[PDB]
Amino acid sequence: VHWTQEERDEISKTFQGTDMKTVVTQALDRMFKVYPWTNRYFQKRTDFRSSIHAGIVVGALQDAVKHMDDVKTLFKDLSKKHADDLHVDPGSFHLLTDCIIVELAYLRKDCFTPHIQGIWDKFFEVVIDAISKQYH
Amino acid sequence: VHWTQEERDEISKTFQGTDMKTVVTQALDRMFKVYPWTNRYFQKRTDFRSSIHAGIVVGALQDAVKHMDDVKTLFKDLSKKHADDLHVDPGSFHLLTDCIIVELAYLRKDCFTPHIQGIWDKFFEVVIDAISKQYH
Amino acid sequence: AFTACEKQTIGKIAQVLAKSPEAYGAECLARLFVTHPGSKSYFEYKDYSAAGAKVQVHGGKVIRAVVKAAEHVDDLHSHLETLALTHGKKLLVDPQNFPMLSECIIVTLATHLTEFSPDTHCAVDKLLSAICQELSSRYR
Amino acid sequence: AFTACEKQTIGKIAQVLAKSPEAYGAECLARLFVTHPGSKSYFEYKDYSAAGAKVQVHGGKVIRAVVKAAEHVDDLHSHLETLALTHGKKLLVDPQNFPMLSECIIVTLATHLTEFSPDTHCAVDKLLSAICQELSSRYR
Ligand code: HEM
Numbered sequence: 001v002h003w004t005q006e007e008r009d010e011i012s013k014t015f016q017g018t019d020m021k022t023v024v025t026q027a028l029d030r031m032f033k034v035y036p037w038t039n040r041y042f043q044k045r046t047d048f049r050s051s052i053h054a055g056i057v058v059g060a061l062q063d064a065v066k067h068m069d070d071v072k073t074l075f076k077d078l079s080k081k082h083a084d085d086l087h088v089d090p091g092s093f094h095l096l097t098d099c100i101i102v103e104l105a106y107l108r109k110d111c112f113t114p115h116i117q118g119i120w121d122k123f124f125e126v127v128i129d130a131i132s133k134q135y136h
Numbered sequence: 137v138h139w140t141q142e143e144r145d146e147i148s149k150t151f152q153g154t155d156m157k158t159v160v161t162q163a164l165d166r167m168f169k170v171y172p173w174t175n176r177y178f179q180k181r182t183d184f185r186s187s188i189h190a191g192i193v194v195g196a197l198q199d200a201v202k203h204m205d206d207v208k209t210l211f212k213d214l215s216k217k218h219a220d221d222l223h224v225d226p227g228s229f230h231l232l233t234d235c236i237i238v239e240l241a242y243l244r245k246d247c248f249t250p251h252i253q254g255i256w257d258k259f260f261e262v263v264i265d266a267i268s269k270q271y272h
Numbered sequence: 273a274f275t276a277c278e279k280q281t282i283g284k285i286a287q288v289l290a291k292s293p294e295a296y297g298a299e300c301l302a303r304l305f306v307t308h309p310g311s312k313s314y315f316e317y318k319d320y321s322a323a324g325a326k327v328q329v330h331g332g333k334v335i336r337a338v339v340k341a342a343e344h345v346d347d348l349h350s351h352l353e354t355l356a357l358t359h360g361k362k363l364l365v366d367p368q369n370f371p372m373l374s375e376c377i378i379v380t381l382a383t384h385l386t387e388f389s390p391d392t393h394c395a396v397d398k399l400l401s402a403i404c405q406e407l408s409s410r411y412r
Numbered sequence: 413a414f415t416a417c418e419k420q421t422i423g424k425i426a427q428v429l430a431k432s433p434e435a436y437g438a439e440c441l442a443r444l445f446v447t448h449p450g451s452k453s454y455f456e457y458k459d460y461s462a463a464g465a466k467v468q469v470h471g472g473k474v475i476r477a478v479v480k481a482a483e484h485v486d487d488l489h490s491h492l493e494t495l496a497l498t499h500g501k502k503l504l505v506d507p508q509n510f511p512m513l514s515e516c517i518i519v520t521l522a523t524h525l526t527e528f529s530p531d532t533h534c535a536v537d538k539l540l541s542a543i544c545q546e547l548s549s550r551y552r
């Protein structure tokens with residue numbers, strides 16, 4: 001994957017000027033309602049909180065944004081953790097990122113243009129691939 | 137993509153020791169019956185022949201195997217052809233490769249083991265990605 | 273498989289889309305063309321943006337059909353039959369594209385609608401899925 | 413949705429499968445585990461090959477269900493109702509996995525059957541498609 005400066009800027013700027021923690025919190029809740037089967041992993045953690053989890057997820061994305069050209073190497077362990085430890089079906093990864101795009105769209109309204117959506121789609125595609133890599 | 141010694145031989149040995157032109161001819165006929173909408177690209181080609189087209193398709197795959205290390209670069213022009221001139225839905229590429237796998241399995245019967253199928257699956261994944269690259 | 277609650281949300285959303293079918297539909301298609309370029313393969317347009325005249329006309333045909341389906345939700349199978357025959361027997365559009373467009377309609381609704389809560393999203397996603405399944409039902 | 417000729421082919425494939433559900437199902441799942449490693453996340457096995465005992469027990473339940481569905485084609489919605497709820501409400505298996513197994517069942521038949529013509533392939537695919545449709549109908 002190759003990034004243009006405009007794409008880097010759109011992603012980096014949004015993470016520094018938008019409350020991604022809230023966006024991701026609402027994206028998780030949206031996901032649990034539209035794609036109920038994803039609850040599978042959390043109905044077991046009695047003290048699970050969307051707010052805390054979102055913060056943990058945004059902390060990883062924020063990291064991916066800083067090493068955008070090496071997301072695969074950066075997420076190697078996170079990927080192994082999801083495959084071997086958590087046993088998360090990698091097919092569910094896009095259900096969350098797709099919900100984040102809906103929340104970004106809902107937040108930016110007419111400013112979330114097809115072109116801007118394309119940049120985020122591209123970014124989440126790179127993130128899904130990096131985190132799905134260590135599934136053997 | 138990194139190919140183990142085992143996969144490189146499986147692929148090359150087959151294109152070598154097997155009648156791949158017949159396999160793809162039947163794969164094409166199989167795709168036209170199982171996924172009827174793929175016929176649209178040949179409905180106006182009055183002189184179309186499955187066996188002729190197959191030799192041409194096998195030609196590119198043979199070239200992809202010779203350059204298994206960089207199919208992406210090799211298929212750049214072919215990808216632009218399918219995208220710009222032929223206007224083939226890239227989402228239809230796997231319908232043919234999936235049928236080639238069914239023909240290989242019907243051909244090798246019990247010798248087409250899950251592990252061997254994985255080799256071919258990864259190969260056609262690399263090929264579909266290479267032929268879909270130039271769609272913008 | 274639609275409760276009375278989902279019926280009210282759907283009808284309420286069909287009302288909004290009916291106001292300007294072409295504008296909403298054009299935006300839906302533009303997102304699809306940007307996110308899934310392969311889908312451009314079915315249209316011979318010069319402009320694949322929301323402003324394209326051909327995209328506006330097609331976008332409008334698509335949304336109007338969605339609005340009408342939302343109104344005949346009680347009999348989706350008999351209502352979308354003609355439309356299902358058209359895609360599967362005449363247009364021969366690869367069915368793998370239907371769900372792709374459904375997600376772009378969802379994103380388009382989120383950028384417009386004042387309220388787009390998980391519940392509304394779910395009701396709308398359920399209608400589009402039902403519509404996509406009918407449209408893919410007459411290929412073979 | 414099934415011509416009288418498709419039900420005959422379906423009826424022929426169901427008898428071949430019913431003879432060795434464990435062996436056949438195990439091969440189907442092994443192929444799924446190799447080509448789509450993510451599907452392994454639902455099972456806690458030590459051996460994911462067709463030689464595994466756990467894989468054969470599960471593979472057996474899966475294939476016998478298909479055999480029975482092949483028997484109840486005239487009303488798949490009613491016959492498969494219970495299994496759909498189990499998948500949709502109890503197991504919570506991501507429905508995206510269903511079509512992936514369908515293709516592995518198809519490859520498995522191709523390596524075993526004496527005759528697997530495109531006509532026979534089409535009838536089986538249509539049956540697997542309908543089963544996948546019903547199994548994902550009660551998630552939301
Ligand atoms: C695609 C974006 C995602 C990213 C970047 C991400 C990142 C993370 C991170 C950084 C952790 C903490 C790792 C640790 O415990 O040391 C985590 C834990 C976890 N993730 Fe993911 N994740 C993503 C998507 C998902 C999805 C969609 C699911 C499943 C529906 C999921 C389920 C889990 C679970 C169950 C845990 C552990 C729960 C806990 O310990 O509280 N993740 N994830």
Ligand code: HEM
Nearest residue numbers: 174177181192193196197217222224228229232263264267
């Ligand atoms: C990934 C496997 C495929 C490969 C390697 C492949 C390869 C080729 C090659 C080498 C050509 C010749 C290009 C030239 O004119 O120089 C070609 C032509 C063409 N391909 Fe593909 N192709 C593949 C899949 C498909 C599929 C799935 C379709 C559509 C169902 C398709 C439709 C066509 C058409 C319509 C032509 C023109 C043939 C003619 O003029 O008679 N291709 N392809």
Ligand code: HEM
Nearest residue numbers: 311314315330333334337338358363365369370373374403
């Ligand atoms: C929400 C799903 C969709 C709906 C409700 C829908 C609806 C329609 C309608 C109402 C028409 C007009 C048919 C006529 O002229 O009688 C049509 C035409 C068409 N549709 Fe679909 N469609 C859908 C998805 C798609 C997708 C995803 C594609 C392909 C990317 C597609 C490609 C076409 C094409 C090529 C035409 C012909 C355009 C023309 O005649 O100029 N449709 N569709």
Ligand code: HEM
Nearest residue numbers: 451454455473474477478495498503505509510513514544
């Ligand atoms: C498309 C064909 C499928 C059919 C007909 C089918 C059939 C079955 C049947 C009959 C059972 C046992 C029902 C019971 O005892 O209540 C079962 C269990 C289960 N299925 Fe499915 N299934 C299918 C696909 C899938 C797929 C693709 C996965 C995931 C990769 C999956 C995961 C499960 C799991 C985890 C169980 C529970 C097994 C256990 O805990 O022992 N199923 N399935």
